[PDB]
C-alpha cells in the first residue's frame, strides 16, 4: 500500500506508516502529495506534476469533460475505489458532480475493477476512462489509436516521502529542482514513458 | 510545456508558517477552490 | 523586484531579500520556486504549476 488512514482507529498503513514509524528514511515511489499525508510526513517538492484526465479513442468530437457530462450515449467511468474515482465522489464542482451522479448510478456498468479492464473497454466499446494523466500518457504511447481528451481536471504532484522533521527533505527538494532545471527529469520521463 | 516550474508562497528559512501554508494550499487544491480562483481571474 | 542574487557581492534583492532579512513574514505573489531561491528562503509547495 501507498498509505491511507483508517477511518475508525486513525492508524496509517503503507509507505506512509513506514515513514511515521521511522522504519524507512525515504519513500521513493509515485507517492501523491496530499493534504492528509502532508500533515503526518514531510514530502519533497514534486518530481512530477500531473492531474486527472480522460482516455478515449481518437477521431471523435469529444474535447472535454463537459462534452461527456452533458450526454449519455458515450459511457464513462473510472477504476473503482481508486484516487480518480474518489476525486469525483467529492467534487462539488458542477460538471464533476454531474459526472459522479452518472457513474454512481450506472456503477455496475461503468466502474471497472482494474486499469487494464478499463483500457479494454475504451478499445472495444464506446467508452471513456477517467484516470491519472501519467497513466494515460503511458497508455497512449503504447496504443496509437487512443488519446487524452482535454486537459487536466485537477492538479497534483508525486513527491519523495520522508519522516516529519527529516533533514533529507530539503536536500532532496533542492536536488529535484536542479535535476528539473537541467532537463534531466524530463529525459528520465521520456526514457520510461516513450513507446 | 517546455520546462516545468511552480509558483509558491515565500517565507523566511525556518518559518513555522511554511508547512501550514503548504497544507492549506493542498487542501484548497483538492477541494477545487484554486481551480475556481484561477478561472475567476483568467477567463475572458 | 521578485528576487535575484548579485553576481559580484552576493546580496539579494526584491521580495526574497525582504524574507531573508525578516522584514516580511510571507511573500504572496507569483514567486517562482527555483534552486537558487530555495537555498535561501523556505517556499510553500506550489499553488500553481506551469
Ligand atoms: O500515492 C498514491 O496513493 C497514488 C498511488 C498510485 C495510483 C495510480 C493510479 N490509480 C491506480 C488504480 F488503478 F487503482 C486507479 C488509478 C487512478 O486512480 O486513476 C498511479 C500511480 C500512483 C500515484 N499515487
Ligand atoms: O519569480 C519570478 O522571478 C517570476 C516573475 C514574474 C515573471 C512573469 C513572466 N516574465 C515577465 C517578463 F515580461 F519580463 C518576461 C516574462 C517571461 O519570462 O516569460 C510571470 C509572472 C512572474 C513569475 N515569477
UniProtKB/Swiss-Prot annotation, chain A:
Protein localization: Cell membrane; Postsynaptic cell membrane
Tissue-level expression: Highest expression is found in the olfactory lobe, piriform cortex, dentate gyrus, hippocampus, granular cell layer of the cerebellum, and in caudate-putamen.
PTM note: Sumoylation mediates kainate receptor-mediated endocytosis and regulates synaptic transmission. Sumoylation is enhanced by PIAS3 and desumoylated by SENP1. Ubiquitinated. Ubiquitination regulates the GRIK2 levels at the synapse by leading kainate receptor degradation through proteasome.
Coiled-coil stretches: none
Positions with a binding annotation for L-glutamate: 30, 32, 37, 83-84, 132
Glycosylated sites: 145
Annotated effect of mutating residue 145 to Q: Loss of glycosylation
Record text on subunit structure and interactions: Homotetramer and heterotetramer with GRIK5. Tetramers may be formed by the dimerization of dimers. Assembles into a kainate-gated homomeric channel that does not bind AMPA. Can form functional heteromeric receptors with GRIK4 and GRIK5. Can form functional heteromeric receptors with GRIK3. Interacts with DLG4. Interacts with NETO2. Interacts (via C-terminus) with KLHL17 (via kelch repeats); the interaction targets GRIK2 for degradation via ubiquitin-proteasome pathway.
Protein purpose: Ionotropic glutamate receptor that functions as a cation-permeable ligand-gated ion channel, gated by L-glutamate and the glutamatergic agonist kainic acid. L-glutamate acts as an excitatory neurotransmitter at many synapses in the central nervous system. Binding of the excitatory neurotransmitter L-glutamate induces a conformation change, leading to the opening of the cation channel, and thereby converts the chemical signal to an electrical impulse. The receptor then desensitizes rapidly and enters a transient inactive state, characterized by the presence of bound agonist. Independent of its ionotropic glutamate receptor activity, acts as a thermoreceptor conferring sensitivity to cold temperatures. Functions in dorsal root ganglion neurons.
Protein name according to UniProt: Glutamate receptor ionotropic, kainate 2
Origin organism lineage: Eukaryota, Metazoa, Chordata, Craniata, Vertebrata
Gene coding for it: Grik2
Full protein segment contained here: 487 to 801 of 908
